[PDB]
Amino acid sequence: NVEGVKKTILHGGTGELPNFITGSRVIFHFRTMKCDEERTVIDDSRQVGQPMHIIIGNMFKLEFWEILLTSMRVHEVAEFWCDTIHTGVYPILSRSLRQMAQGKDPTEWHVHTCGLANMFAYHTLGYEDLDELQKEPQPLVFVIELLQVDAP
Amino acid sequence: NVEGVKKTILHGGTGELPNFITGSRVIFHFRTMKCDEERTVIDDSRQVGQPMHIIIGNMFKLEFWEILLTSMRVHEVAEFWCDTIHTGVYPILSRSLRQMAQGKDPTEWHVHTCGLANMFAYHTLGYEDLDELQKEPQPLVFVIELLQVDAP
Ligand SMILES: C/C=C(\C)CC/C=C(\C)CCC=C(C)C
């Protein structure tokens, strides 16, 4: 559907596209991997236990992840191959998820400011994988399972 | 009252200490200056037009600025000299205020992430003064006027 983005369904879900209206919360699992042989995992919501929650802000102005998610039926499991053009911000995104996974609030001031502090002082996202990933740009495969969609 | 912090009242305000209870919003003006001869201004809420708003989070665990503000009567104008120990985070704080001053939301995702992006890519807070200030640590004088205190 979009440039530098190959989607492949793995397990079609029940029903047709749901109502991805602005302010909906989309609940899902993802596993993020490199495109090497070992297919190296970088993040996995199943590994951490809890599933992921986003909330569509502007259905007419979507974020790249929302492009991916909004193309999915409930209980769909889909593999999204993604060209460099769209993987650049992933490490900062991941950094933010990993902080939320420890109940640190990545948009609370005290953690936001410590984050900029360290980032600036030490030239690191905090994790070796994300830093390697930051210094060696590349495509990524996300495997995603859409679990629930709820409206405002 | 505290180490590496010299306060001097300039114009005593009406009444005695107000109720700085947790969740209060404190409304004030500040002007932030170096301790050189020219007394170089770095930030001034009067220059930008609007006064500043903070909201006490934990009255038993206060932030250094809250230490300063919570020691003030309404309409007080006070000068707070501050030793290196407490000025290190100022440039990141300032960066955040300058973004809020352009109605950019410094804890919204899209701006938070662009911010980390640039900070990491370019090794800058975005403004030459804050970067100079970041590479040459020092004390600072804040002059502050407390305007209003409102409770939850
Ligand atoms: C309300 C919006 C947010 C809190 C931003 C969260 C963003 C993500 C969780 C990225 C989605 C993960 C992928 C692997 C595409």
Ligand SMILES: C/C=C(\C)CC/C=C(\C)CCC=C(C)C
């Ligand atoms: C609700 C809390 C915040 C939005 C953080 C805002 C912090 C400041 C505005 C710093 C105060 C300015 C000084 C010069 C000490």
